[PDB]
UniProtKB/Swiss-Prot annotation:
This is Lysozyme C. The keyword Signal applies. Its EC number is 3.2.1.17. It comes from the Eukaryota. It comes from Gallus gallus. Belongs to the glycosyl hydrolase 22 family.
Amino acid sequence: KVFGRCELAAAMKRHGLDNYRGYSLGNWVCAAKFESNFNTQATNRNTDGSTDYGILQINSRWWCNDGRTPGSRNLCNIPCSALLSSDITASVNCAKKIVSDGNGMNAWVAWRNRCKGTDVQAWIRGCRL
Ligand SMILES: [Cl-]
Ligand code: NA
Ligand code: NA
């Protein structure tokens, strides 16, 4: 599913991401835009042989099981393919676990490089929320 900006903000709000660990909603929308272009089916292979999956590009080295990442962990306890569904429940719950882990949203390279320190409110401007 390719989400619309406002449609994604509303699903993110419903699942309790707005101000989760102090990250306002526009942070999560902005991270989604640059990680997956709002596409729940996006996959990207990393140099280390791990793969990122879904709307928040959650990585198979720590967070989900894809059966092909030697010696990885599965801390969100899910097959990585669960992260590609048009329902984002699995991605959001897993993201709550990641963002609590110590580095906050710096865990998302595109967030650190493209969203951090910018006017992230712009990402939810005009949304009926
Ligand atoms: Cl933080
Ligand atoms: Na915001
Ligand atoms: Na594996």
